Design a protein around this ligand. Structure first.
Ligand SMILES: Nc1ncnc2c1ncn2[C@@H]1O[C@H](COP(=O)(O)OP(=O)(O)O)[C@@H](O)[C@H]1O
Ligand SMILES: [Cl-]
Ligand SMILES: [Mg+2]
Ligand SMILES: [Mg+2]
Lengths: 19, 355, 6
């Protein structure tokens, strides 16, 4: 599990729920 | 050589007691029935021929591909909030060996009890929340004093005798003695209860992951459902972030240094008093916020949690169960249980419990 | 989620 790939997914998801 | 004869069908094995030096003795039991089954093995209920007492027999396959520490860990445990290992024995997947664990039988779990209230649309009364959480923290304080981390704390692993309201921690198939300096597997703990450092893939975590899991149990009991659901790690971390807000760089560093340089979107925290129902007791909210912390070293220790103001009602001499009976034994702390912080005895043992 | 490998 690469940090880069994980953070990439997390960043994408957080942008979506971001007010 | 398991001799199975008839009295009612009786099974005889030579089994080794859980405590002391290995001195195996003949054990006879009857009335066997499955009370649980999985890909790990089988779990049976049975009746000891001699005493008539009920026991559970957890049958687990000897998987040589993974570390099997469950037996060795249970054998050194002896506490009122941890399920007792009476005996163990081996038996026959043909041409393969199974480990049989004979435990005290406990009829319910925290999960099953909580599920009753959920489908009834009622909240678990605070008194039971206090009692169950307190006993959980006691068992954690105990196993942590040996350096043992459970690594699978969740409602399904918390056995209940609802008549006496006694909670017993079970399932040590994931448990391990953590050694500072030796890496551990990060993909551990069950979904919904995995600490953030585990989701971030930390291999150097400590026993404080058990405290996070406990914080999730507490929150679940107050809420009526899991607080951080989600199928994957990202799904769960999002739910966590939606409550705690985006972790700071220092917090990310405390969890896993390899993530310190990513620019995560900055999501604001949802205030705890807005997370739970408006009827929720303030001290439960306070306790929960001190368990569900990003920084593992900022979380309360189990012994400190026991001393928290939320459990003050349990230290009242006049306190009693809703059914009429007295509360279980809550104050019989040993020097070992208190080894992490001996001065906490002043709070943990009320004056009326000194006599 | 199993424990560590051997
Ligand atoms: N000592 C016991 N007495 C009664 N039921 C038990 C006992 N131990 C476990 N169980 C039940 O069987 C289930 C599985 O036990 P567990 O040790 O957690 O197995 P697993 O490691 O496969 O999850 C538990 O959720 C619990 O409901
Ligand atoms: Cl936001
Ligand atoms: Mg289990
Ligand atoms: Mg297990």
């Amino acid at each position: 599990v690469e940090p880069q790939k994980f953070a990439e997914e997390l960043i994408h998801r957080l942008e979506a729920v971001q007010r | 050589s398991m001799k199975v004869s008839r009295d009612s069908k009786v099974t005889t094995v030579v089994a080794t007691p859980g405590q002391g030096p290995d001195r195996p003795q003949e054990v006879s039991y009857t009335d066997t029935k499955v009370i649980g089954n999985g890909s790990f093995g089988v779990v049976y209920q049975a009746k000891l021929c001699d005493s008539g007492e009920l026991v559970a027999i957890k049958k687990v396959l000897q998987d040589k591909r993974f570390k099997n520490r469950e037996l060795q860990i249970m054998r050194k445990l002896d506490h009122c909030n941890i399920v007792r290992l009476r005996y163990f024995f081996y038996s026959s997947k043909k041409d393969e060996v199974y480990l049989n664990l004979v435990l005290d039988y406990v009829p319910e779990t925290v999960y099953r009890v909580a599920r009753h209230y959920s489908r009834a649309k009622q909240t678990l009364p605070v008194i039971y929340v206090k009692l169950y959480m307190y006993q959980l923290f006691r068992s954690l304080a105990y196993i942590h004093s040996f350096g043992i981390c459970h690594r699978d704390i969740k409602p399904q692993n918390l056995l209940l005798d609802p008549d006496t309201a006694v909670l017993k921690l079970c399932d040590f198939g994931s448990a391990k003695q953590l050694v500072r300096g030796e890496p551990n597997v990060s993909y551990i703990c069950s979904r919904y209860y995995r600490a953030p450092e585990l989701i971030f893939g930390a291999t150097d975590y400590t026993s404080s992951i058990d405290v996070w899991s406990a914080g999730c149990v507490l929150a679940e009991l107050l809420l009526g459902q899991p607080i951080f659901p989600g199928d994957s790690g990202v799904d769960q971390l999002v739910e966590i972030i939606k409550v705690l807000g985006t972790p700071t760089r220092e917090q990310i560093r405390e969890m896993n240094p390899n993530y310190t340089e990513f620019k995560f979107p900055q999501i604001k925290a949802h205030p705890w008093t807005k997370v739970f129902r408006p009827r929720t007791p303030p001290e439960a909210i306070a306790l929960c916020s001190r368990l569900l912390e990003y920084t593992p070293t900022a979380r309360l220790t189990p012994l400190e949690a026991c001393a928290h103001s939320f459990f003050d009602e349990l230290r009242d001499p006049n306190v009693k169960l809703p059914n009429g009976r007295d509360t279980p034994a809550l104050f019989n702390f040993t020097t070992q249980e208190l080894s992490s912080n001996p001065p906490l005895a002043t709070i943990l043992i009320p004056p009326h419990a000194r006599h | 989620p199993p424990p560590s490998p051997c």
